[PDB]
């Protein structure tokens, strides 16, 4: 992660299950009211050259975004937003338990 500046870059980890050549992923997470950036690197078969596809936000953002075609750090973007937007297991505060 070549970049600018630090952040304080807590990290999300998935599995792309919805895809066929289901692969998990990795992208960081950093905190922002408006929502943050990410980056994300992409999935694996026998070493980390394989991928899935997701590539898009939702419409917050720390201000910044991410760099690149950076699909899959959009997707992570929206992921975060899934999985920390999640109210239905609580607040953004709450993710660490």
Same mark, same amino acid.
């Given at each position: 992660?070549?970049? $600018? %500046? #630090?952040?304080?870059?807590?990290?999300?980890?998935?599995?792309?299950?919805?895809?066929?050549?289901?692969?998990?992923?990795? $992208?960081?997470?950093?905190?922002?009211?408006?929502? %943050?950036?990410?980056?994300? &690197?992409?999935?694996?078969?026998?070493?980390?050259?394989?991928?899935?596809?997701?590539?898009?936000?939702?419409?917050? !953002?720390?201000?910044?975004?991410?760099?690149?075609?950076?699909?899959? %750090? %959009? &997707?992570?973007?929206?992921?975060?937003?899934? &999985?920390?937007?999640?109210? $239905?297991?609580?607040? !953004?505060?709450? &993710?660490? #338990?």
């Amino acid at each position: 992660e070549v970049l $600018a %500046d #630090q952040m304080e870059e807590m990290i999300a980890v998935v599995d792309r299950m919805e895809d066929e050549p289901r692969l998990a992923l990795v $992208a960081f997470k950093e905190m922002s009211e408006s929502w %943050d950036v990410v980056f994300s &690197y992409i999935c694996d078969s026998m070493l980390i050259e394989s991928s899935n596809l997701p590539t898009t936000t939702h419409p917050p !953002k720390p201000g910044d975004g991410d760099k690149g075609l950076s699909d899959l %750090d %959009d &997707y992570g973007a929206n992921l975060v937003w899934f &999985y920390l937007h999640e109210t $239905a297991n609580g607040g !953004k505060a709450e &993710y660490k #338990q």
